[PDB]
Amino acid sequence: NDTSEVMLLDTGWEFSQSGTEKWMPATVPGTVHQDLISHELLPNPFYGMNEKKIQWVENEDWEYRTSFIVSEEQLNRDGIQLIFEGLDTYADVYLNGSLLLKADNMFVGYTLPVKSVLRKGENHLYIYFHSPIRQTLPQYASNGFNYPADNDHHEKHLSVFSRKAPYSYGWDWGIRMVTSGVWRPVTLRFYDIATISDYYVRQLSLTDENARLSNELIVNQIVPQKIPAEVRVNVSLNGTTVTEVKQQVTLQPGINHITLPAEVTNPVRWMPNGWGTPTLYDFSAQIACGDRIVAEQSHRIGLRTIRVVNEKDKDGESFYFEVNGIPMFAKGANYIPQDALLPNVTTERYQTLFRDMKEANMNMVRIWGGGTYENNLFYDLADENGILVWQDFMFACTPYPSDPTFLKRVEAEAVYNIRRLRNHASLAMWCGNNEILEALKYWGFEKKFTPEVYQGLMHGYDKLFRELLPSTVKEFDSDRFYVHSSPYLANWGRPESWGTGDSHNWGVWYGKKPFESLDTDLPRFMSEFGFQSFPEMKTIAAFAAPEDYQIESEVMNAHQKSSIGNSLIRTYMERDYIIPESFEDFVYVGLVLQGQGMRHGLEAHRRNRPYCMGTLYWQLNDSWPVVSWSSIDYYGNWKALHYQAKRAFAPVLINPIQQNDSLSVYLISDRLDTMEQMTLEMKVVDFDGKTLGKKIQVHSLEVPANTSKCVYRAKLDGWLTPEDCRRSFLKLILKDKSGHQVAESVHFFRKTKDLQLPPTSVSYQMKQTDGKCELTLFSSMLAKDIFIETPLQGARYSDNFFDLLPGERKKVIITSPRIKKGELPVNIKHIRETYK
Numbered sequence: 001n002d003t004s005e006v007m008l009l010d011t012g013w014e015f016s017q018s019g020t021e022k023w024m025p026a027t028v029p030g031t032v033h034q035d036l037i038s039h040e041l042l043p044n045p046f047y048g049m050n051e052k053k054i055q056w057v058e059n060e061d062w063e064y065r066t067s068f069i070v071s072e073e074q075l076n077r078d079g080i081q082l083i084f085e086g087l088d089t090y091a092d093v094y095l096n097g098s099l100l101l102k103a104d105n106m107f108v109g110y111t112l113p114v115k116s117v118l119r120k121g122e123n124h125l126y127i128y129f130h131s132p133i134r135q136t137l138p139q140y141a142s143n144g145f146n147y148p149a150d151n152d153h154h155e156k157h158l159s160v161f162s163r164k165a166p167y168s169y170g171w172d173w174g175i176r177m178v179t180s181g182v183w184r185p186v187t188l189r190f191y192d193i194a195t196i197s198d199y200y201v202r203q204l205s206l207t208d209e210n211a212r213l214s215n216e217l218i219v220n221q222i223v224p225q226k227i228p229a230e231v232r233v234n235v236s237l238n239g240t241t242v243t244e245v246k247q248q249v250t251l252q253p254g255i256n257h258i259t260l261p262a263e264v265t266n267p268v269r270w271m272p273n274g275w276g277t278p279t280l281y282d283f284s285a286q287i288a289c290g291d292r293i294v295a296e297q298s299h300r301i302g303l304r305t306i307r308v309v310n311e312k313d314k315d316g317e318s319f320y321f322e323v324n325g326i327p328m329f330a331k332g333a334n335y336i337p338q339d340a341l342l343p344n345v346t347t348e349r350y351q352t353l354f355r356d357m358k359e360a361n362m363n364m365v366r367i368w369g370g371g372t373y374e375n376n377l378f379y380d381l382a383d384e385n386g387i388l389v390w391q392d393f394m395f396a397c398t399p400y401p402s403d404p405t406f407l408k409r410v411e412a413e414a415v416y417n418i419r420r421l422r423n424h425a426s427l428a429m430w431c432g433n434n435e436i437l438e439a440l441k442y443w444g445f446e447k448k449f450t451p452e453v454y455q456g457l458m459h460g461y462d463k464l465f466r467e468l469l470p471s472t473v474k475e476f477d478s479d480r481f482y483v484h485s486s487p488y489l490a491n492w493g494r495p496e497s498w499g500t501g502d503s504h505n506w507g508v509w510y511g512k513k514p515f516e517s518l519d520t521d522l523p524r525f526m527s528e529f530g531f532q533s534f535p536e537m538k539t540i541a542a543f544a545a546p547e548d549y550q551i552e553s554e555v556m557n558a559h560q561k562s563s564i565g566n567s568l569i570r571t572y573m574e575r576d577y578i579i580p581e582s583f584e585d586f587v588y589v590g591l592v593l594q595g596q597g598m599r600h601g602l603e604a605h606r607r608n609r610p611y612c613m614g615t616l617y618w619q620l621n622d623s624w625p626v627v628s629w630s631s632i633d634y635y636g637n638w639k640a641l642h643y644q645a646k647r648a649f650a651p652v653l654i655n656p657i658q659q660n661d662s663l664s665v666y667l668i669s670d671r672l673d674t675m676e677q678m679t680l681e682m683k684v685v686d687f688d689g690k691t692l693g694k695k696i697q698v699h700s701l702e703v704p705a706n707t708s709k710c711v712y713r714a715k716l717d718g719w720l721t722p723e724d725c726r727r728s729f730l731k732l733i734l735k736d737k738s739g740h741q742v743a744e745s746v747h748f749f750r751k752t753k754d755l756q757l758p759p760t761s762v763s764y765q766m767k768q769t770d771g772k773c774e775l776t777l778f779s780s781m782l783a784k785d786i787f788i789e790t791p792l793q794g795a796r797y798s799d800n801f802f803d804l805l806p807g808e809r810k811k812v813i814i815t816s817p818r819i820k821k822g823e824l825p826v827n828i829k830h831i832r833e834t835y836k
């Protein structure tokens, strides 16, 4: 919003495999792999078994070029700046015969002064990407040991040497595609006098009465004269000015530091999803020289406090978030990259993923450390959806080097991304890495390395995670929490450690523990736990053949990367369900299983507030069509788990929990207000619809804000017979004084495999128009865990993976832009259908 002119360098690019002298059109931002695919120079890397057939790319070097025109009038501007938001990774940048940059960190943006190198007329930009494998082979050869990075799918674990997305080398839900390229935008800015290098809105204090801010600017003045200027900051809300402040300065050549206080009286606070509005102010900083605004930069700013409380207490050491002074139970998931090829993730895909977290009642996301520091749009969407962000630095599972050069590269990326992200309302904390200290302690090592190399790794840990990173946070983001590792102390095999900080409870899945264990094995905060599923059939059809459907088949094992995969799924399924004979039915029941088991954990964590203060499941999403722990597949289809997470995260939840042949019912609220004069009503209904016994009523209930409380206990014995338990379910509703329903739940008394489910038809009527299909479903008898299956990729449902209750009609709306007036194919599956 100033006199500068920005040229986007996003057209006219060509690329070439080094040594071929053969050039073709490219798409920038982009990746080498996509550029090849677009010219049918590579097969669909996600299809079938194309993974092995695409690996060759990682051994070549790749060159990119573009030309552009500069006019005499542009060449005459005071300054001209070329900005690379992202280069993956070892890139030699040449412009007009000048080596401008030898890039070496995927996570750093580079700002380059180029006016003295540009020419009137045609200009030639030329980028040389060294193979990150061949670049680091000599480095590895000199190292004399292989770092234990099991997720790096190569004999030589080269990932640890490069500041490049860890997942790109492979992971336990991911394809190996060690790509290269101009992965974020390239801009040329022509400007006068100065640019704003950094604008930081630093909150000094916040009360209901006043927010005090400090506007900290860094201005890079490019001309040799002293330049009188006036710095102005405008604070607005919804287009209307709230306050305005200004400061006279004379800008000196080079860097200038400018600080302007501003205050907002009676500030409208940013609140997280579920507690109100994610209000964002617009803060705009301008540099005005005479009549002209030579430089402007704005941020959207949310006014709130976030405190992470991590303190010794009677239970061990707490780990929770206090938002605007109120302890906030965290509800969310771990986020991984949305694609093997990052530039392929569109604005639309980011918007939809946030819609998916918001609609599932989430208030937090963990950006896990084997991915990337996300793009600005991700954090912008987190801001406007009221989702808190836990940001790992990009270190995961393995110890890393700690030599001076390496720590210099890391320092660059830490400074860059902290300054990049620190104005976001959503940003809640930093975490040095995923599971490295656990790895060092327990994985085990010290049987794997000499004592000397082991000691070096231990000192190397401290240098990076207990010194460099926490110092950098203290300097550049001094009011945000940092912890050196997640989990920082708790280990899932060591019950004595569970009351200390956050847990990754991998007892379920890796430890083979039943889902019931989640009721007893409680953390102070669950930062990971999870369970895998095959994605639904239309997703399998994007990647496998009917031949290719047994699963531990070649491909159906090729698409599983956990240490066991599809073995474990069957093992757990047998505990609770009849294992279906057909592959398609097995896929359906596996979705149901992951949903039901995980939901039982999310409920245990909320039920056990305040001992437990959060649950973030592993994992939200997928990077490609694969078998994984995700609740949303690569094509955006919600698995059962996503619907179940939405239910389990509902602001008010009725939670029936049955153990030791007894039922308790808890009422769980994350509301900010207390509910008074409430009635819990329950009744036992058989699978034919017939009420058994009488309604049970619990009157005069209070549901206080932000609490979980037991309101009802009954022994099963004397109430229902073992036969009644396999033949009926419990219906529960909660209502206010007048009889308006605020919540409902259903409860089963036995495992699904033990239920005497009746054969039944789910019939439906359909009303189909452009973009929309409204179905009304009916079954005279219980239909268990119904799946409404359509072939349309990414179709959205008002509900799915729910029990259709006997004789009770249920409306479901299906939407997709592909739905054309004039029949959407619909296949309704339910549990009884899967066996005979």
Ligand SMILES: NCCCC/N=C1\N[C@H](CO)[C@@H](O)[C@H](O)[C@@H]1O
Pocket: 171, 172, 173, 370, 396, 397, 434, 435, 504, 506, 510, 528, 562, 618, 629
């Ligand atoms: N020793 C095996 C236990 C690893 C637990 N951690 C994770 N599990 C996920 C699924 O396996 C994995 O993708 C992530 O790195 C995560 O931190």
Ligand SMILES: [Br-]
Pocket: 078, 079, 080, 081, 113, 114, 115, 116, 222
């Ligand atoms: Br310049």
Ligand SMILES: [Br-]
Pocket: 081, 111, 112, 113, 220
């Ligand atoms: Br510059």
Ligand SMILES: [Br-]
Pocket: 255, 256, 257, 258
């Ligand atoms: Br200064």
Ligand SMILES: [Br-]
Pocket: 272, 273, 274, 275, 362, 363, 670
């Ligand atoms: Br919330």
Ligand SMILES: [Br-]
Pocket: 465, 466, 467, 470, 483, 484
């Ligand atoms: Br620390």
Ligand SMILES: [Br-]
Pocket: 658, 659, 660, 661, 662
């Ligand atoms: Br029981």
Ligand SMILES: [Cl-]
Pocket: 310, 311, 312, 317
């Ligand atoms: Cl502590």
Ligand SMILES: [Cl-]
Pocket: 145, 448, 449, 450, 453
């Ligand atoms: Cl060794």
Ligand SMILES: [Cl-]
Pocket: 656, 657, 658, 659
């Ligand atoms: Cl239960």
Ligand SMILES: [Cl-]
Pocket: 576, 577, 750, 751, 752, 753
């Ligand atoms: Cl069950």
